[model samples]
Target: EVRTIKVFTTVDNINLHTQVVDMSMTYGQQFGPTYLDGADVTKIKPHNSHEGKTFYVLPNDDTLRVEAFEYYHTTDPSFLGRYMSALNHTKKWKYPQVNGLTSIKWADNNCYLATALLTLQQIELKFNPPALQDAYYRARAGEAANFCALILAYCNKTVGELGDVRETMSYLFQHANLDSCKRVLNVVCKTCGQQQTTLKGVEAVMYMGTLSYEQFKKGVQIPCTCGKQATKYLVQQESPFVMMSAPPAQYELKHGTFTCASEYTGNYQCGHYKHITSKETLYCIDGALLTKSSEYKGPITDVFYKENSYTTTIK
Candidate 1:
């Protein structure tokens, strides 16, 4: 069997991704895969980590991979997002932020794994996990109640499958054992004939394009980019943290990127010189602040960040 492996610095900060050690290897070999290019394994062994330092090799592939050999005493704070994704978040499990906790409950202890699995299944419930005991203590009339309503909505067989989510959750929690609800987090995509284009969760977020579980199970009929209809299903299954991206990044976009100059301001004096709008100003395709006097001419088009970079550099 093929074993793909990557490295991480700490289990506490799972975001500190090291590198893709190797995407090609075998189970026949036992010391896991080599680091970098067949480098000495000890060269990259766990020397220091976020919480306590520990040493072990890990599998880092697209399968429902687990790196669960760490502490599970308790966990959640406000989710910290990375890159451009709100949902592409930091570690799902974390210590509750409250300091005055008189007694921490057991579910609060298991909440890290619990919420991780819940979110990995694409359930949209938010709880101040660091305040988990606080949340759990007040579960009756507080955010915890709000959380349960959604859980019952989800597990009550009111809409989704699995008969009773309560039954599955009950059996495991009653026994006080950790259960992993693993679904390959996937980019729900739309196909256009041979070209299957995947949309980021944000891309589809602006539309009603919601999907039921079975609808995802057996692809749905959605129009391709063109009039020719195509199927939309979970296309990029290998990309687990790649879907149902949430709204924090949207706020970031609002706060950072200003209004895109909607109307054409003016043009410059060359045919090849395109007029670009950004930050309420006009720039030439060649990266000069365009003199807006109808001096240049062409079908003006907006050249975005990356376009302006590669299109011209050092003449």
Candidate 2:
């Protein structure tokens, strides 16, 4: 009988393929020694009987291998039972899997953690403009006081007149969070300001004290809570959650161990369950019907996790 073996690499760059042949494989006779040390599987002593013979052919590569153990082996946690042999691997990678096509991307979790810190700086720089040179350094040093102070000071020097102040104030207001808004307004109280669903509200997502261009028009500036002429207002609004049910499961298990039996059960029962053995051995879950192995662990029943589209900004 002729059998072929093949293996593939998952990584890019190194492309190397080789084939192995010149093999001598045959089954031993049931009675006596077909051959001695010289009559090994390689030479097939006495030209191994041609009646019926079988041998396993495994594929291997420089980066990949072809040996695997059954997942449902029942015994001690460290069941050293398998039909195949090993390579240079100090120990085989053991895990929960039903197929020989199991896999993993090494060092992936640690890589993501490294990226998180890098993304933090990207998000921080987004909120602060390039002009925040002095303020940015101080803020990075963990002092919000100097950062807030420098921004207000810079605005005071640039905005000289009422119109300029109004224009500049509106410009800065666009991106500033509630903290920046309040700090800017502290300077603008001498110059000028709700909750509404349509962005027309007095206080949107950002707020501070004493903000009303209309109050300035009335010639009566609205004093902040600090000034004791404060006014408080509560609002009611609706916020809907983006919750959703999990999508339909994509299952490989929707469809889906090989320890062959021997002549003890008789020639009628051939390989694996071809013969029945009272002793239960471990085998692959996919080979369940073909073998006499018992369950080693419970099977996974359900797996449903989800992620929503709405992601809040870091700032």
Candidate 3:
């Protein structure tokens, strides 16, 4: 004869990924492990004889079997009773509600609280032994105020803008509940004008404002919000140092002084000349007089006057 059992386990009563393994004991002394995927399986552990041989069950082969047994052990009614009784021995199994209060001491209550906050719902909860229907609503009002403060600190917006935000919170708390108030605060804090996002916007504005023409000339380009390069509006007029379109008037004398043909032909002579030439007399025609002319022209024409100086001194 063979006996077999199926087993499964769960932590939270919600999601259960059950592992079903089977344990089988045959009347002839061999035990087999079964898997949930297909069917029952049996194996001979002691290789040779039915008698006088030591049987060894390889853990590798029995892994599925062990897991199944563990699952069965957890779901077994006696085992569950023992488990619940042990928990009750340490105040872990029970959280009796009174009037309108719930079991707040249970760790799973946090999940309940989160659900309430998200869905704008509520459940009975307790911090003490007695009912707290009146106290619960009062506490929610105060808690909503605290949530508002937290939302304000997280979002760095002006009070005027946050007026709407506050109004929304108030409406939620009054019309919906404290959980709804918290939900509104969270949505506003996370999605509406977050501090980091606002700061980034300010920085982008300042960066554009501070960019100068010098930076534009130096190839400093900024990315615009529209996903294109934002360049300064450059004057498409002309350069300060423009070159002549056709080269300057063609002058033979770009530099250095020179006499023109008319001047060379003596249209007007200078006031002075070097000497008397055999062909013509040189003269400074443009002048009134040559003050540097020699007074003893040719030779000593006053030789007679100097020689008669003795006759005049005959005394």
In the order shown, the candidates' Cα RMSDs to the true structure are 22.4, 30.0, 48.1
Q: Which digits, one per residue and each the tens of the lDDT, describe model 3 over residues 44-150?
A: 22222222222222123244334423432222223322322222222222222311223222232122221122112122222220112222343354322222222
Candidate 1, residues 1-315: lDDT per residue as tens digits? Answer: 543444443222333444333334322143343232112344333222212222233333322033222221122111111110211121121223121111112221222222223321232222322222233344433223323222322232221122221232332232221222122223233442344343432232111232122244355566645566665554323212212211111111111122111112222221121122232332222211223322223332211111000111111
Clashing pairs in 3: 102-125, 270-284, 271-284, 272-284
Roughly what TM-score does model 3 have, to 2 decimal places? Answer: 0.15
Q: Can you tell me which runs of candidate 1 are displaced by over 4 Å?
A: 1-129, 140-192, 195-211, 235-315
Q: State in Å the error of residue 41, model 3.
A: 23
lDDT score, residue 45, model 3? 26
Candidate 2 lDDT over 205-283, as tens digits, reads 2222212222211223345535634323312211111011111222121111211111111122221111111224533
Worst 10 residues of 1 by lDDT: 303-312
Model 2 ranges with Cα > 4 A deviation: 1-128, 142-154, 158-172, 177-197, 200-203, 206-315
- Arranged by lDDT with the best first, the candidates are 1, 2, 3
What lDDT does model 3 reach?
A: 0.22
User: Candidate 3: misplaced stretches above 4 Å?
Assistant: 1-3, 8-93, 104-315
Using alpha carbons, what is the TM-score of model 1? 0.20
